[PDB]
Amino acid sequence: PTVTMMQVEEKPDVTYSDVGGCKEQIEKLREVVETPLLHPERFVNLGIEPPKGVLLFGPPGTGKTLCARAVANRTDACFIRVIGSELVQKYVGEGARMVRELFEMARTKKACLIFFDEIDAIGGGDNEVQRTMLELINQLDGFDPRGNIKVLMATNRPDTLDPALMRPGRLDRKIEFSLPDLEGRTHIFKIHARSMSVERDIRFELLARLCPNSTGAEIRSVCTEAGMFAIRARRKIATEKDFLEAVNKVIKSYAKFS
Amino acid sequence: VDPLVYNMSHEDPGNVSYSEIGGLSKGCLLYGPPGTGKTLLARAVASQLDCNFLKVVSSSIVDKYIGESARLIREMFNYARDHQPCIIFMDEIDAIGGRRFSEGTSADREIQRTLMELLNQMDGFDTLHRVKMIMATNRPDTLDPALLRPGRLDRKIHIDLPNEQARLDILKIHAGPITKHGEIDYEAIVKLSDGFNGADLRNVCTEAGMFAIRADHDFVVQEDFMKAVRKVADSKKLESK
Amino acid sequence: MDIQKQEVREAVELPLTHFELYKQIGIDPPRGVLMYGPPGCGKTMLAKAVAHHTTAAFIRVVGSEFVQKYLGEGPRMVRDVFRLAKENAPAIIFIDEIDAIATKRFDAQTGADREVQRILLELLNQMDGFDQNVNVKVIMATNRADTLDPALLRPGRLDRKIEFPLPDRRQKRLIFSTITSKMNLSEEVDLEDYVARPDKISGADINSICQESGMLAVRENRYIVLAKDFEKAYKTV
Amino acid sequence: DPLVTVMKVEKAPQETYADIGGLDNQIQEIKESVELPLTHPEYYEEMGIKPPKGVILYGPPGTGKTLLAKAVANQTSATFLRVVGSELIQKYLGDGPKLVRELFRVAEEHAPSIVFIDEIDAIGTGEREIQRTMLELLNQLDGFDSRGDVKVIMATNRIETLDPALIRPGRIDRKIEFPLPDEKTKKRIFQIHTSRMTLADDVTLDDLIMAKDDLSGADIKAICTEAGLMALRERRMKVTNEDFKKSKENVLYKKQE
Amino acid sequence: LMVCNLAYSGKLEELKESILADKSLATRTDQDSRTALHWACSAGHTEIVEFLLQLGVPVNDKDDAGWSPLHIAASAGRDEIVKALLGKGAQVNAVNQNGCTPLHYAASKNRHEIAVMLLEGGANPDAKDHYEATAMHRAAAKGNLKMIHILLYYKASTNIQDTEGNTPLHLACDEERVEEAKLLVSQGASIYIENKEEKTPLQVAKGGLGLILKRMVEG
Amino acid sequence: YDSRVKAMEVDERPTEQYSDIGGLDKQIQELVEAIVLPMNHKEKFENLGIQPPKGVLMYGPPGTGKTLLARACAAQTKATFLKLAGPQLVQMFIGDGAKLVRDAFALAKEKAPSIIFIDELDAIGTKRFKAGDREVQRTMLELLNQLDGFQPNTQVKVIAATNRVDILDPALLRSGRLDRKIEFPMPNEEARARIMQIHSRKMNVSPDVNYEELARCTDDFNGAQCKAVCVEAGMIALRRGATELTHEDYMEGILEVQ
């Protein structure tokens, strides 16, 4: 199918600098996303096998940022990510051959890592979906491609009981990621230091502390709408005194009803 | 009609089962709370001739769709009235034997409505002098006291082992291919067994032969039969609730 | 009532029992009789009464009798029926539900319906040619009069247009008497709320509703049917 | 395929962004939105953002007048891509997103262009396949494998017809609202449609901006055309008041019929 | 049960020996909440209900729906059973399943004696059911002229609005009863009340009968 | 044809054996005999006239690990192992359960001698008096008819396991049906320390384990729960620095996952 090769992704994106305030969680996932690849022998000799992975779910908030963080975090080669909203199409059956050929290509890519996003779009009649998701469980719990590289699922609601009862077999370490802290938003501004031209007079800590409930996606929209109003301003560089109305307008005028 | 292929295609052989039922000398009630074998007898004569293989499973009146099972009651019973010879078996009737004491739901009301058709065709405007039905069951408590009228079930045939000659006969026909030592004593096995199940007494005797086969001895003495049929039979009495 | 039974009586069965009187009793073509009314059941007890008052052949062909993949089977079927009618005995053709085969059409996606309505035009001209000594009757009943073709409603073809009233009080009394006459007669059974309630909630096949009420009164705990299975049979179906 | 020819226009109309007034900010928002990429690039490529998605608008009058009067700003000196009506998907069997792939390959070979989707009534007008080919339209429209190639400007009539799932992937840059054309916007539309033509002195404006009620510019352009021809029957270019009310009766009857 | 056959078929000595041998059988009911009184009143037996009512069976024993035995005696046409049930003190205004009264079902059988005995005991002449319909709508719906007349011996109303807004004159004219319409109009019927369909009694009557209706109103 | 049911769980043989548990020989030895003697001693079956039962009821509380234990015995059966799930019979289309049952007996009857272990039978064994569990009474009573009316059913056994005995079907008593009713209660702290010791005989366990602290903390637990504590200990023991298993990891895992 054209969606299979269409779903191939190799593009640089968010680096590790966007840790969302989670001090312990970023180590719980960092010791499984960074250390097993860097030290393959330390985890085989020191233990019996490297850890499996983590499980980011719950409230979306600033979701998909840590996925790109995992994509660019690899110091060797970015891995492939797969969304789950591509399996609900006409003429079902592409799921089996799709997962078998991307796991076969995972065997061809010398034990590369494969991410599966949006499990809620294929989990939770539905028997034609039960074939693809139960066969998907047969391809995850089945160690034929690999049972050691990576396990991680992203869902909006815990209403998927089949992956919740089949996940204790191989998946483990369920964690949460809701919102960053005060000291994080200035680091999302630190990764936005390479965005649209920001004058050195603008302080990242000031703009970061002058907006509560400002998760990385909402302030990504602050840089998007504020970038658009900075383009409409016909100015060589951006100054916080020029788009602060865009900031508090886009967070407060939208924070009224939502 | 799909079930007619199953009811007119399968044939079970065996002519000795008619004489292997033990010392046992328009409707028949087969309640066997302290006794199994209701399938070895109906399947014994049914395996002998039966004149057909018109078996009626209690799971064929499910009617997942709208409860119009009257087309199947009048269709299959109309085939019974069409063909001059016919023998009908009703095994495991306790599932469809709801007593409808309280307000039954839509699932129970359709089954009890098929029971109302059974009333309309047993004590209604239809005779059943030539056809014979065999209502097999397990417990004489949920047997539809409205259907327990003596107009259908003349006598009561409880598959049990009251007489010592019946237990000794069934024990001797089940003890055919087994080999034992020269010391034979059936009076202890038949005497100590009081109100048990027949095929499950075969399972207890063969369970005693498998208890005695642990020591890989070809000969099997009757000591393991007395103590293993005794203890295992006591475990059946514990699991007889 | 008696208006429909009298009009169908003298307009239908009196010309049927007389041969070659058409051009001697004041020649007219009242051969087409049309009935109407969706809420009334009809078309069954009237056809039975016709089949009992007269002893002849009857061609019961519901309008969807020629809806098949073979477009040319129509004229063969209705032409064999025409010849066996004019030859054997003056039968009666019961054409029902002409709404689905009497609707105008301009496009060629449904060319089967336009072809069979051109067959309807063919026999519509054959009945014009058969105005002299035809040995058959053609009754008709429809439930829709909005999308009917103007050729059928043209005078000379359908000169009898009967209607059905919403309150079938006499048909309710006769349909309850015709079922209680054989069933056990209970003095508790009333017919006033069951002749006034169907005036509001009107429906069809009331005799089948009484038969379902008997199927609910066959429990053998209640010897004779009563209001429980009457109102219960109403609220179920 | 004759349906491909009627998709887009290849002409350069003289209608610019300076021929209409009142919505100068509303037209400079889309002008500044889609005229910054590929043209005047010092404020676009030096910043390092490149949101190749474009804004999505909607015209309450619609019927090509307002949406083509806003999209016509990009048509001055540039290539244009037009898509009007969702009938092209529903007038044939469910071939699928292959037509979207054809527009994507002609847009790939015609990168310096503007994508304009008009009359978005896919779900508003099998029905189960329309939702999956529309979600596939959102999938291929997002640009998952392609870089900045073309700016897509969508244009619908009712904002409630579109599902909430078609908003976040599609509309990512900016959206705005269009005011109600009751008296002053219809006065400006009447002035623009009666700027080149010649009208008499007795032609009043209050009755013309009063008798109308929720009307687009296609009917006033139609009565300007048939009024210029009807007045042209007497070999005169001046449009009298009684002839423009006689042509106004077509407006009064057309919306009421 | 067996007492259903005993009271149904009229077994005198079998029911007497059955009750004298087991007094519980009188209070026992079947699966439809119907005691022996309902079967012996539905069958019309006098001696059996005289024995059961002699022992003192409750007269207000309602079934699952609410059908009191007084409806069975009223619709049954048996004057003696009405004498017994009214003698024991039956509720003349008992509420059945559809909220009707024994006056509607006694009027259904055109029994004058039952209506005189029930209405004499204190029955409501204008007793309305769930559909706000009295006995005059049904008696006029069948053609019971003398039943409506003996209903007018107790000064009953003739303008009861039905659930659709139809007066008894509307149902009398709909039944094509000329003498009943002339009697109701001559006794105080209203020709100005309209139903939910906005139709006067003059328009409902066919064949120009509204002209003689209003002619009898003004005359 | 119809590989979705034919190829349900194609497994040749598992890895674990019966020697992985401790303290259950008094109740598992009857099953080990009941699977070894009917595979090699077919010759002696004619001298004694013995027919092995085809229905064994392996019932008990959930989490006991009866699935992996019956599979551990299936490694000793040496035949082909074929799993099957309870909720697989409930399908959208009509008559599917007949195809699943007749297909299972098509591979067992037609194919080579194999081993078919099912689980979660109690989740569908409801004796209701429309209803889906009555459709499972059609398919279920159909299976009981294929285990009651078939005298040539002397072929491959039908092993079943229920996680609860609340809805006890009275019609499951027959020589060919689930007659073997061996009660498997919740293992005590001694048996849990035995199965946890033999299941943890591979990790570098400290020799100074008196089993008193873990025997006290393990209160009313199950087999697979202590297996999850062992696996969790094998998960964090790697990241604890010390390659040797410590003593706090037991209670740390118990309070971690529970």
Side-chain angles (χ1 to χ4, degrees):
Chain A
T2 61
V3 66
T4 64
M5 64 180 289
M6 179 67 199
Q7 206 173 7
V8 180
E9 181 69 25
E10 291 96 358
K11 290 295 289 183
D13 46 1
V14 168
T15 186
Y16 183 75
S17 68
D18 277 339
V19 47
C22 293
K23 185 177 180 180
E24 292 180 353
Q25 285 81 16
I26 202 69
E27 179 66 28
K28 293 172 74 68
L29 56 90
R30 183 173 67 190
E31 70 188 359
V32 78
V33 74
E34 291 187 358
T35 313
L37 182 64
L38 185 63
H39 298 284
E41 193 268 334
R42 184 179 293 171
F43 282 171
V44 173
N45 193 1
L46 186 63
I48 184 66
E49 66 252 7
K52 299 294 187 291
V54 296
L55 185 67
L56 288 170
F57 63 97
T62 176
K64 202 179 90 276
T65 302
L66 294 175
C67 298
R69 183 264 311 156
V71 169
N73 200 1
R74 289 177 63 89
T75 187
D76 292 332
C78 63
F79 66 94
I80 306 300
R81 60 180 176 88
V82 172
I83 64 170
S85 178
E86 298 297 328
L87 278 77
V88 279
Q89 291 179 357
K90 66 182 178 67
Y91 189 70
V92 297
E94 293 91 2
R97 293 175 65 190
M98 186 183 291
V99 67
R100 288 177 67 187
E101 75 182 1
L102 68 91
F103 279 167
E104 184 67 28
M105 287 177 70
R107 298 181 185 93
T108 310
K109 290 296 289 183
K110 60 182 181 180
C112 183
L113 277 69
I114 302 298
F115 178 66
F116 291 99
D117 195 1
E118 292 180 353
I119 192 170
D120 56 354
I122 51 96
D126 289 330
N127 292 114
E128 63 183 2
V129 182
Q130 290 294 113
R131 296 180 186 177
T132 61
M133 68 177 288
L134 286 174
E135 186 175 1
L136 183 64
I137 296 299
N138 199 4
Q139 292 298 110
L140 265 71
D141 289 332
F143 61 93
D144 196 2
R146 187 65 182 270
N148 206 1
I149 39 171
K150 182 180 175 67
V151 283
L152 207 158
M153 293 297 174
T155 184
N156 195 2
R157 291 180 179 90
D159 293 330
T160 62
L161 277 76
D162 184 74
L165 64 93
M166 293 304 291
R167 73 179 175 88
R170 180 162 172 257
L171 278 77
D172 200 358
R173 193 67 65 192
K174 55 181 181 180
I175 57 173
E176 286 289 328
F177 187 76
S178 179
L179 78 159
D181 292 331
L182 186 64
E183 68 271 15
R185 298 174 181 90
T186 185
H187 288 88
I188 291 102
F189 288 163
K190 281 175 94 288
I191 205 171
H192 281 87
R194 295 175 292 174
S195 66
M196 183 266 175
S197 295
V198 171
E199 190 179 3
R200 292 181 179 91
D201 199 3
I202 298 170
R203 292 178 292 173
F204 291 163
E205 60 183 1
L206 185 69
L207 185 62
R209 75 181 182 179
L210 260 64
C211 56
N213 295 115
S214 296
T215 64
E218 184 170 357
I219 53 180
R220 185 178 66 189
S221 66
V222 169
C223 294
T224 300
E225 300 293 329
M228 181 64 206
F229 286 166
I231 291 169
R232 291 177 65 190
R234 292 287 185 181
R235 294 183 294 113
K236 298 291 184 182
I237 46 94
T239 309
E240 62 183 2
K241 72 181 178 67
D242 291 329
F243 64 90
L244 65 88
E245 183 67 28
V247 176
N248 60 8
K249 182 169 70 69
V250 85
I251 66 170
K252 289 293 183 182
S253 73
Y254 289 165
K256 286 180 181 179
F257 62 93
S258 66
Chain B
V1 48
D2 196 2
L4 189 64
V5 177
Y6 289 164
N7 294 121
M8 294 299 290
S9 296
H10 186 74
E11 192 272 331
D12 191 75
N15 300 115
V16 192
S17 62
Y18 181 75
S19 179
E20 285 181 352
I21 62 170
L24 193 146
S25 296
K26 64 182 181 293
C28 179
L29 184 62
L30 294 181
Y31 61 100
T36 186
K38 65 190 72 65
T39 311
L40 294 173
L41 192 144
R43 198 178 67 189
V45 180
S47 68
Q48 178 65 259
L49 183 62
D50 201 5
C51 196
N52 59 7
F53 196 69
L54 200 145
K55 180 67 174 66
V56 178
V57 185
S58 66
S59 68
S60 178
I61 321 100
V62 281
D63 199 353
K64 292 165 66 172
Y65 56 94
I66 298 97
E68 58 183 1
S69 296
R71 71 177 182 89
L72 183 62
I73 300 298
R74 275 91 61 84
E75 183 178 1
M76 182 180 71
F77 287 165
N78 197 2
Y79 290 163
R81 295 179 183 92
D82 185 74
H83 295 89
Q84 285 75 240
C86 182
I87 295 171
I88 297 170
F89 287 165
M90 296 180 74
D91 187 74
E92 204 262 332
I93 203 169
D94 55 354
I96 62 170
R99 293 178 66 188
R100 63 184 183 273
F101 183 75
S102 179
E103 193 272 331
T105 186
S106 66
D108 186 74
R109 194 257 190 185
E110 60 183 1
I111 298 169
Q112 296 296 321
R113 186 176 64 248
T114 60
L115 267 66
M116 301 303 165
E117 294 292 328
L118 291 175
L119 290 169
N120 204 170
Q121 292 180 356
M122 288 189 287
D123 284 333
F125 296 100
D126 189 76
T127 185
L128 301 176
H129 64 279
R130 188 174 176 87
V131 72
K132 181 70 175 178
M133 60 186 73
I134 304 299
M135 289 181 181
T137 184
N138 289 316
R139 294 178 293 173
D141 57 356
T142 61
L143 282 183
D144 298 327
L147 292 175
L148 288 177
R149 189 73 179 171
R152 287 84 169 268
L153 303 170
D154 292 331
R155 292 293 301 273
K156 51 181 73 175
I157 295 94
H158 55 87
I159 302 98
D160 291 328
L161 286 80
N163 193 1
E164 304 291 325
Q165 187 61 255
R167 189 178 298 277
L168 182 62
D169 195 1
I170 197 73
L171 185 62
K172 285 298 290 183
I173 64 99
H174 282 288
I178 188 66
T179 181
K180 294 179 288 293
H181 198 267
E183 191 271 331
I184 48 100
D185 187 74
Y186 293 100
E187 188 177 1
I189 301 299
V190 178
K191 184 177 179 180
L192 267 70
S193 296
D194 291 330
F196 288 163
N197 309 109
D200 293 331
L201 186 62
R202 189 260 187 189
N203 291 119
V204 167
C205 292
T206 57
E207 187 67 28
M210 291 182 284
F211 180 75
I213 207 167
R214 296 175 66 189
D216 63 27
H217 283 88
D218 51 355
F219 66 95
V220 176
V221 297
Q222 289 182 354
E223 191 270 333
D224 291 331
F225 288 164
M226 293 182 286
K227 297 296 289 183
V229 167
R230 183 179 181 271
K231 291 296 289 184
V232 167
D234 290 331
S235 296
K236 296 296 289 183
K237 293 295 289 183
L238 290 174
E239 292 291 328
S240 66
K241 65 179 73 175
Chain C
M1 204 69 203
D2 205 5
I3 50 103
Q4 185 178 5
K5 294 190 287 184
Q6 189 70 41
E7 186 68 28
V8 175
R9 188 77 65 85
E10 289 183 353
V12 171
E13 89 170 7
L14 268 67
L16 184 64
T17 184
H18 293 90
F19 296 100
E20 287 95 8
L21 269 76
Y22 291 161
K23 70 274 289 178
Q24 276 84 17
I25 55 100
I27 176 65
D28 282 327
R31 63 176 60 89
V33 177
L34 184 63
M35 293 180 284
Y36 190 72
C41 182
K43 300 178 287 185
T44 300
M45 293 181 285
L46 298 174
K48 285 181 181 180
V50 169
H52 283 287
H53 290 88
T54 61
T55 61
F58 297 99
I59 304 299
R60 47 185 68 188
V61 278
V62 182
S64 179
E65 91 274 22
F66 59 89
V67 182
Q68 293 294 321
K69 64 182 181 180
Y70 288 164
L71 57 94
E73 190 67 28
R76 292 182 179 92
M77 292 186 289
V78 303
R79 186 175 294 113
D80 288 331
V81 172
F82 279 167
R83 63 182 294 275
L84 72 89
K86 69 179 74 174
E87 194 271 332
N88 194 1
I92 297 169
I93 298 170
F94 175 72
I95 299 170
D96 191 4
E97 292 180 353
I98 67 166
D99 56 353
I101 60 170
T103 304
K104 64 183 181 293
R105 192 72 181 91
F106 185 75
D107 292 331
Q109 285 92 22
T110 63
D113 185 74
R114 190 175 177 87
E115 196 273 333
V116 302
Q117 81 182 357
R118 285 195 299 267
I119 298 165
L120 185 65
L121 193 144
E122 183 179 1
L123 60 95
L124 191 66
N125 198 3
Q126 290 181 357
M127 67 179 288
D128 290 331
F130 290 163
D131 286 334
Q132 295 299 110
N133 291 317
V134 57
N135 297 115
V136 76
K137 293 291 183 69
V138 179
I139 58 175
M140 191 177 288
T142 187
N143 54 4
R144 291 180 67 188
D146 53 356
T147 62
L148 291 182
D149 291 331
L152 294 175
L153 276 76
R154 202 264 296 164
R157 301 182 187 276
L158 295 173
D159 290 331
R160 295 291 184 268
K161 290 183 180 180
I162 314 169
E163 295 292 328
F164 289 163
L166 181 62
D168 291 330
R169 293 180 179 92
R170 271 73 174 175
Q171 287 81 17
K172 293 294 186 291
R173 292 177 183 176
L174 290 174
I175 206 165
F176 276 104
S177 67
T178 196
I179 193 65
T180 199
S181 296
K182 194 262 188 296
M183 198 67 203
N184 208 166
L185 287 169
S186 179
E187 55 192 2
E188 187 181 0
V189 170
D190 194 0
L191 293 174
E192 284 174 344
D193 53 353
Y194 294 107
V195 83
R197 187 170 184 265
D199 179 74
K200 284 91 171 66
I201 39 107
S202 178
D205 61 19
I206 308 298
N207 195 2
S208 296
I209 298 170
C210 295
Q211 292 179 357
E212 293 293 328
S213 180
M215 292 179 184
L216 269 70
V218 79
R219 190 178 295 114
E220 293 292 328
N221 289 318
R222 51 193 297 166
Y223 295 161
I224 309 169
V225 71
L226 287 175
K228 290 182 182 290
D229 290 331
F230 287 163
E231 193 271 331
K232 183 174 174 66
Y234 278 168
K235 71 181 182 180
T236 50
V237 67
Chain D
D1 189 73
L3 190 62
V4 181
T5 304
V6 299
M7 289 294 175
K8 67 179 181 294
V9 64
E10 290 85 4
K11 295 184 289 293
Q14 292 84 18
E15 294 292 327
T16 62
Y17 62 93
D19 292 330
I20 60 174
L23 46 96
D24 55 354
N25 195 2
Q26 193 173 6
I27 193 168
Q28 80 182 358
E29 190 271 330
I30 185 167
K31 188 82 174 178
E32 193 76 21
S33 178
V34 303
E35 283 291 328
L36 261 290
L38 191 137
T39 52
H40 188 275
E42 61 266 23
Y43 288 165
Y44 184 76
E45 71 183 1
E46 294 292 327
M47 304 303 173
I49 299 299
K50 189 174 71 68
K53 291 293 291 182
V55 295
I56 295 169
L57 304 182
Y58 61 95
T63 323
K65 191 261 185 294
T66 302
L67 297 171
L68 195 142
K70 293 177 183 176
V72 77
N74 301 317
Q75 295 178 356
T76 63
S77 296
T79 312
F80 187 75
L81 179 62
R82 182 174 60 85
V83 171
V84 174
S86 296
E87 186 178 1
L88 59 99
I89 299 295
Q90 297 177 357
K91 71 184 289 184
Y92 193 72
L93 201 266
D95 186 71
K98 290 180 71 68
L99 278 76
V100 183
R101 294 181 185 272
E102 293 179 354
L103 294 175
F104 184 75
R105 66 179 176 88
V106 73
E108 183 178 1
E109 294 292 328
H110 292 88
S113 298
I114 293 95
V115 176
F116 184 74
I117 300 169
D118 191 72
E119 292 292 327
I120 306 168
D121 288 329
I123 198 166
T125 61
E127 187 177 1
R128 63 178 176 87
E129 189 177 1
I130 301 168
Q131 185 178 2
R132 68 195 71 187
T133 193
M134 182 174 68
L135 184 63
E136 185 68 28
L137 176 62
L138 183 66
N139 191 4
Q140 188 176 1
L141 194 142
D142 189 74
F144 185 74
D145 61 351
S146 178
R147 293 176 65 189
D149 190 77
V150 73
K151 300 296 289 184
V152 176
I153 298 170
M154 295 175 72
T156 186
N157 290 319
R158 187 179 297 276
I159 202 66
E160 295 293 327
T161 59
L162 295 175
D163 291 331
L166 297 170
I167 297 170
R168 296 293 300 273
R171 186 262 179 191
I172 205 66
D173 187 75
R174 182 65 178 172
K175 72 182 289 184
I176 46 94
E177 204 268 338
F178 182 73
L180 51 101
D182 52 354
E183 54 183 2
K184 298 181 291 296
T185 306
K186 283 185 176 180
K187 186 176 180 180
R188 182 66 178 171
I189 288 168
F190 177 76
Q191 184 66 41
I192 297 164
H193 285 86
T194 58
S195 294
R196 295 181 184 272
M197 293 178 70
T198 62
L199 49 92
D201 186 75
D202 58 355
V203 177
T204 61
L205 275 75
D206 197 2
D207 56 354
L208 296 172
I209 68 170
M210 184 177 177
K212 292 191 287 290
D213 188 75
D214 292 332
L215 186 69
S216 66
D219 288 331
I220 193 167
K221 187 181 288 293
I223 67 167
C224 284
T225 300
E226 72 183 1
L229 183 62
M230 186 66 203
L232 193 63
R233 295 289 298 274
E234 292 180 354
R235 293 179 292 174
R236 293 187 293 113
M237 64 183 73
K238 183 173 72 69
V239 176
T240 60
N241 196 1
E242 62 184 1
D243 186 75
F244 199 78
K245 295 188 293 293
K246 185 174 73 69
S247 68
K248 187 68 170 65
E249 195 270 332
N250 195 2
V251 164
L252 185 62
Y253 171 74
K254 180 69 172 65
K255 61 182 69 176
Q256 291 179 356
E257 192 271 331
Chain E
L1 294 174
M2 190 175 178
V3 297
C4 295
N5 285 318
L6 266 63
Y8 182 75
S9 65
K11 298 294 187 291
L12 187 64
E13 63 183 1
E14 189 176 1
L15 182 139
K16 284 184 178 179
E17 186 179 1
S18 294
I19 294 175
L20 288 174
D22 192 1
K23 295 290 183 182
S24 67
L25 294 174
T27 61
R28 287 181 183 271
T29 186
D30 56 354
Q31 294 179 356
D32 291 331
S33 180
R34 295 177 183 176
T35 61
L37 184 63
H38 297 89
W39 294 102
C41 288
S42 179
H45 292 290
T46 300
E47 185 67 28
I48 289 93
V49 303
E50 283 180 352
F51 186 75
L52 291 173
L53 288 172
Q54 183 178 2
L55 266 69
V57 61
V59 70
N60 291 319
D61 287 332
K62 290 182 181 292
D63 56 355
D64 290 330
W67 289 94
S68 66
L70 189 61
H71 295 87
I72 303 170
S75 178
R78 299 293 185 270
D79 291 331
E80 185 68 28
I81 312 300
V82 180
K83 291 182 181 180
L85 291 184
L86 286 181
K88 297 284 103 176
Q91 292 180 356
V92 298
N93 296 115
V95 283
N96 56 2
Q97 183 178 2
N98 55 4
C100 294
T101 58
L103 183 63
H104 300 86
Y105 305 97
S108 179
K109 199 58 69 178
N110 206 167
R111 294 291 183 268
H112 303 89
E113 293 86 4
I114 300 173
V116 171
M117 294 174 190
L118 288 174
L119 293 173
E120 183 68 28
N124 192 1
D126 292 329
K128 297 178 183 180
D129 58 355
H130 290 171
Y131 290 99
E132 302 292 326
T134 57
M136 191 177 292
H137 294 283
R138 296 178 182 178
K142 281 188 71 68
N144 292 319
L145 191 271
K146 300 293 183 182
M147 180 60 69
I148 297 169
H149 196 271
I150 65 171
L151 282 172
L152 263 68
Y153 270 106
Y154 290 97
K155 278 79 176 175
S157 179
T158 61
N159 290 318
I160 292 96
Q161 293 179 356
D162 201 359
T163 185
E164 199 67 27
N166 286 316
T167 62
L169 184 61
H170 288 88
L171 278 79
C173 294
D174 199 3
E175 200 67 28
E176 295 293 327
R177 299 279 80 80
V178 178
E179 294 293 328
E180 296 183 354
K182 292 190 289 185
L183 184 61
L184 290 174
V185 166
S186 71
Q187 287 298 110
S190 178
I191 63 169
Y192 295 99
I193 300 170
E194 293 180 353
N195 55 3
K196 290 173 70 175
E197 294 178 354
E198 197 178 1
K199 291 182 180 180
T200 62
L202 279 77
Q203 294 179 356
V204 178
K206 272 78 70 177
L209 199 139
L211 295 175
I212 64 171
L213 281 175
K214 189 175 181 180
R215 184 83 277 279
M216 289 296 173
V217 169
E218 293 179 353
Chain F
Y1 63 94
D2 191 73
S3 178
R4 68 178 180 89
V5 177
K6 181 176 89 275
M8 45 177 73
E9 289 293 328
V10 179
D11 186 74
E12 290 85 4
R13 77 271 292 159
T15 62
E16 67 271 15
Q17 69 272 16
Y18 72 98
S19 296
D20 290 331
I21 50 95
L24 281 80
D25 292 331
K26 66 183 288 184
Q27 61 185 358
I28 204 170
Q29 187 177 2
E30 184 66 31
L31 183 63
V32 174
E33 292 179 354
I35 64 169
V36 168
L37 73 91
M39 191 66 204
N40 200 4
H41 294 89
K42 286 288 188 182
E43 292 85 4
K44 293 176 71 68
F45 284 166
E46 294 293 328
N47 287 317
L48 300 174
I50 304 299
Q51 294 293 321
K54 307 300 173 181
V56 49
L57 183 62
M58 189 174 180
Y59 64 95
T64 313
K66 62 180 73 67
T67 301
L68 277 76
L69 186 62
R71 189 183 298 114
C73 295
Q76 296 294 321
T77 62
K78 202 63 69 178
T80 301
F81 187 61
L82 297 172
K83 285 176 70 175
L84 182 62
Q88 290 298 110
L89 294 173
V90 177
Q91 298 295 321
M92 182 179 177
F93 290 163
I94 62 171
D96 287 332
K99 185 171 72 176
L100 269 73
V101 171
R102 290 177 64 88
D103 199 3
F105 277 168
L107 271 73
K109 180 76 175 178
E110 185 177 1
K111 264 64 186 299
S114 64
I115 293 296
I116 297 96
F117 172 71
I118 70 170
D119 198 359
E120 289 93 9
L121 186 63
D122 58 351
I124 62 170
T126 302
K127 49 180 182 291
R128 289 182 180 178
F129 294 99
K130 66 182 291 294
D133 289 332
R134 188 162 56 90
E135 306 170 356
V136 192
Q137 286 177 357
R138 181 187 68 185
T139 302
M140 183 177 72
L141 284 174
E142 183 179 1
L143 180 63
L144 270 69
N145 193 7
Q146 293 181 356
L147 271 75
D148 195 2
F150 286 165
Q151 57 179 357
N153 208 166
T154 61
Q155 209 174 1
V156 167
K157 283 80 177 174
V158 178
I159 300 169
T162 61
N163 291 318
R164 191 174 178 180
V165 292
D166 53 355
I167 307 298
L168 183 63
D169 194 1
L172 291 176
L173 296 174
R174 191 182 180 272
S175 179
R177 293 178 182 176
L178 299 174
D179 198 4
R180 297 291 183 90
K181 294 188 287 184
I182 302 169
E183 198 267 329
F184 285 163
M186 294 177 71
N188 290 318
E189 67 271 15
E190 293 86 3
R192 289 191 298 268
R194 289 180 184 271
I195 60 98
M196 187 179 71
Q197 182 179 2
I198 306 299
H199 282 168
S200 68
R201 71 182 293 275
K202 188 181 264 78
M203 291 74 167
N204 291 318
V205 179
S206 65
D208 195 1
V209 173
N210 296 115
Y211 296 99
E212 193 271 331
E213 182 68 28
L214 58 93
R216 180 65 179 171
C217 292
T218 53
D219 291 331
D220 291 331
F221 287 169
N222 290 318
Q225 298 179 358
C226 292
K227 289 175 69 68
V229 175
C230 180
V231 172
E232 184 68 27
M235 287 295 290
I236 75 161
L238 178 60
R239 64 177 62 91
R240 281 178 64 88
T243 185
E244 185 176 1
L245 182 62
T246 186
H247 185 73
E248 292 86 4
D249 202 354
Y250 296 101
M251 61 178 287
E252 206 282 335
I254 291 169
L255 274 75
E256 182 67 28
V257 302
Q258 292 178 357

